[PDB]
């Protein structure tokens, strides 16, 4: 994770994607002053393992696209370091049932 | 009689596959080439052969069968013709798309500008959906203006790899009306990109290139976006004075003949260009007359021509005016009036409307006698029958059939008869903003000219009686009847999913009356008690012991009203400041179906959550709740009739 003060030069963004499996993630200090995940609006996000994703798609008979989508630019997706194809489990305090579990696939 | 039997297998459409007509497909499917712009021959009594109304595309007269399929106008789908255009023209709907495609492929060698050697092409081609692929490819290759006969190597930017590029420079392409003009960089060279050269360059696009652009090998290739053989819809599409499409096709044929003669006889290039532009304009206005910038193709009467796009789009187009919503038979509409003596799920149907709207009932050993009697009665008295459909498909109308004598009905036939009592009929008040505004009622035939519905059931419909009109739809099969009665029945709709509370209640006079009836001061003598008890249809037949026995037997209003409330209902609401004793008689306590205390008013019998309606329907069922509606309205309306309630100017005076 690279943390910058103000911005990154455009000539530096192009070389940010290095040789795999090394991944570089850029975050702004101003955007990291407040942790978004502690907001009451923000529910609990838990990254799923590959085995868990396979079990999810098996049990719910889903395809990759039939899951709810989460952009690979969402502040929470950047926060937890999601890569495309990884499914997050969302625990939400519902008002009709106490707990509701959703699943969002990164796109 | 409908349509006669066909031996072709019957299936339901599972997948609708779109695409573009290939010109050879248009030539193959066409049954008659159209060559002359006239519609009728010189005799004016037959359809001209070779004209726009060739009988091979479908007969225009009932007395004549279609020349191709040897079937009448009732059966013939209408078969397409084809006009072989003298020169290719743009499709008006695809011009922009065409532009984009010709902005992505080299205009000389006919190959895509940036193959996978370019950095972003791997990401662009990795996209799955065709539309996003094309969007990325266009937005990346639109700024590239060279075919790049030699490109830097993917391994390293030192050596040069030569691909199948001709090395020319692609132009900047703009649209000037119905044509595309290209400006090549000056070594600018501005020239109109003729449809012939664009069609040529599209026919040179490799399969991989255009399937990466989002096109398909089989269904829609890019070169099919340029028209060379225009399909001619049959006269069924443009019935006849002639239709607007007929005149537009006549104009197209006239322009095509003009250009063809100028080509064959030889002519200056300017006249050829003018004829080509006129042909393009006529084709575009035939397919779209609302082109921005260009003037509308006006009709012979001075009005804009109705193009096909105009026929499709809009509220009155095909989709929204004839497919999403369409005019239907077996429906009535008239003024609505209230009737406190009707059940909640009942609707009053005028005798005339019942005599008009009909239901087909299949002849069964169980209903042979009654349908036979209805047939004997005929269609001019109610109840009766209007038609008999035999197993052979022949229809017997009860009018003019009495001469042939009585009809011996056979099992399996249909008797199409007047809608009678207890027929599930969909009842609707428009705009019909929710599902409760369209509910299944039971027919009660009445001897007057208005629809009659319970006062409560007006609340879901948002219906008054100051001139409102309502619609009545009759199912024409046992399946639709059954699911209408078992899913759309009014009692099943009492509790709305809209707010998990009842949508109907006691309203208007009854509500006022019930408040006046359940006051502590309200005491009822023996005779009025007997009448009110009898007015409850499901009264158990035992007179409750009066609230006061000596010196005069007086029943309170709460005691009599508790007869309407079904046995076994417990309700306990505490209003503002009420105690277990009620100094203000507010609140509500009902124990085992007897109103222990509380004035019965809007909060109790109205459409409120936790009220009497909700409790009754959740405990005993929707049918018992409808029965409760009827009983409460009956008893309260009788009491208010014999008590009276008015209002005047003095009521507004302090």
């Amino acid at each position: 994770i690279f943390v910058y003060q103000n911005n990154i030069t455009p000539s530096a963004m192009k070389l940010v994607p290095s040789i795999p499996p090394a991944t570089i993630e850029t975050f702004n200090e101003a955007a990291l002053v407040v942790n978004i995940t502690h907001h009451e609006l923000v529910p609990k996000h838990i990254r799923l393992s590959s085995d868990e994703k396979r079990e999810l798609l098996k049990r719910y008979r889903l395809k990759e696209s039939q899951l709810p989508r989460i952009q690979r630019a969402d502040p929470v997706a950047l926060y937890l370091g999601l890569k495309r194809g990884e499914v997050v489990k969302i625990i939400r305090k519902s008002e009709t049932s106490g707990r509701y579990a959703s699943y969002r696939i990164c796109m | 009689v409908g349509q006669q039997y066909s031996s072709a297998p019957l299936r339901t459409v599972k997948e609708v596959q779109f695409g573009l007509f290939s010109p050879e497909e248009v030539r193959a499917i066409s049954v008659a080439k159209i060559r002359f712009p006239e519609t009728m021959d010189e005799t004016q009594t037959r359809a001209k052969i070779g004209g726009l109304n060739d009988p091979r595309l479908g007969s225009i007269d009932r007395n004549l069968k279609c020349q191709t399929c040897q079937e009448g106008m009732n059966e013939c789908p209408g078969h397409f013709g084809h006009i072989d255009l003298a020169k290719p023209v743009f499709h008006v709907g695809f011009i922009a798309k065409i532009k984009k495609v010709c902005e992505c492929v080299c205009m000389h060698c006919g190959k895509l500008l940036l193959d996978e050697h370019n950095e972003l092409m791997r990401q662009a081609l990795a996209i799955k959906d065709s539309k996003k692929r094309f969007a990325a490819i266009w937005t990346l290759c639109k700024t590239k203006m060279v075919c790049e006969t030699d490109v830097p190597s993917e391994d390293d930017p030192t050596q040069l790899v030569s691909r199948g590029g001709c090395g020319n420079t692609q132009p900047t392409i703009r649209k000037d009306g119905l044509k595309l003009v290209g400006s090549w960089k000056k070594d600018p060279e501005l020239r109109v990109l003729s449809t012939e050269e664009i069609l040529n360059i599209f026919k040179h696009i490799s399969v991989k290139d255009f399937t990466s652009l989002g096109f398909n090998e089989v269904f829609s290739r890019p070169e099919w976006m340029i028209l060379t053989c225009l399909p001619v819809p049959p006269p069924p599409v443009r019935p006849s004075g002639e239709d607007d499409l007929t005149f537009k096709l006549a104009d197209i044929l006239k322009a095509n003949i003009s250009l063809e003669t100028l080509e064959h006889n030889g002519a200056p290039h300017h006249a050829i260009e003018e004829a080509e532009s006129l042909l393009q304009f006529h084709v575009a206005t035939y397919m779209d007359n609302d082109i921005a910038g260009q003037p509308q193709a006006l009709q012979k009467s001075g009005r804009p021509v109705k193009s096909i796009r105009a026929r499709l789009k809009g509220k009155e187009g095909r989709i929204r005016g004839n497919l999403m919503g369409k005019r239907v038979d077996f429906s009535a509409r008239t003024v609505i009036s209230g009737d406190p003596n009707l059940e909640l799920d009942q609707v009053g149907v005028p005798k005339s409307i019942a005599k008009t709207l009909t239901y087909p009932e299949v002849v069964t050993p169980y209903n042979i006698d009654r349908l036979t009697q209805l047939v004997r009665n005929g269609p001019n008295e109610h109840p009766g029958a209007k038609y008999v459909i035999r197993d052979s498909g022949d229809r017997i109308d009860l009018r003019y059939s009495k001469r042939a004598g009585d009809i011996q009905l056979q099992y399996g036939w249909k008797v199409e008869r007047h809608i009678m009592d207890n027929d599930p009929v969909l009842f609707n008040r428009q705009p019909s903003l929710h599902k409760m505004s369209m509910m299944a009622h039971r027919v009660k035939v009445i001897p007057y000219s208005t629809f009659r519905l319970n006062l409560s059931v007006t609340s879901p419909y948002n219906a008054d009686f100051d001139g409102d009109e309502m619609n009545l739809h009759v199912p024409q099969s046992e399946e639709t009847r059954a699911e209408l009665s078992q899913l759309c029945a009014v009692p099943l709709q009492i509790v709305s999913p809209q707010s998990n509370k009842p949508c109907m209640g006691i309203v208007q006079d009854t509500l006022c009356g019930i408040r006046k009836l359940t006051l502590r001061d309200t005491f009822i003598e023996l005779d009025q008690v007997l009448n009110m008890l009898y007015w409850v249809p499901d009264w158990d037949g035992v007179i409750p012991t009066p609230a006061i026995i000596k010196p005069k037997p007086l029943w309170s209003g709460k005691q009599i009203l508790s007869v309407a409330i079904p046995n076994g209902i417990h309700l306990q609401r505490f209003d503002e400041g009420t105690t277990l004793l009620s100094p203000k008689d507010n609140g509500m306590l009902i124990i085992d179906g007897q109103i222990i205390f509380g004035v019965v008013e809007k909060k109790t019998v109205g459409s409120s959550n936790g009220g009497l309606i909700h409790v009754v329907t959740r405990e005993k069922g929707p049918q018992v709740c409808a029965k409760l509606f009827g009983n409460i309205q009956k008893v309260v309306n009788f009491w208010l009739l014999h008590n009276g309630f008015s209002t005047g100017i003095g009521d507004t005076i302090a």
Partner: protein
């Protein structure tokens, strides 16, 4: 969090005039609007752009343009939507149509 805010906005709209709508209706609305990862508006530029079938996309707005784009892209419409089966005049796979009714010969014989 955007979906939660959208539900709160819709609920405040519903409750401004004192009316009450069940939670699950507004929850379905906000979940449909945010099932694509972003706030999909209820507009011709919003839900109508999703690749959900040309015949039902055109039934709302921009009919002829949708038909042209489907023809150009050779779209395959699977006729799963309500509007597709409404247009083609066939029982939509909804409500009573969300299943198939078939016949058991063995049970019919076992009855008698």
């Amino acid at each position: 969090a955007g979906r939660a805010a959208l539900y709160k906005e819709v609920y405040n709209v519903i409750a401004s005039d004192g009316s009450y709508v069940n939670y699950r209706h507004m929850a379905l609305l906000v979940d449909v609007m945010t099932t694509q990862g972003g706030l999909t508006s209820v507009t011709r530029h919003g839900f109508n752009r999703s690749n959900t079938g040309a015949l039902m996309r055109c039934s709302f707005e921009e009919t002829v343009e949708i038909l042209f784009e489907a023809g150009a892209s050779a779209e395959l419409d699977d006729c799963r939507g309500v509007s597709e089966n409404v247009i083609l005049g066939q029982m939509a796979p909804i409500g009573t149509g969300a299943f198939d009714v078939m016949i058991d010969e063995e049970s019919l014989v076992k009855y008698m």
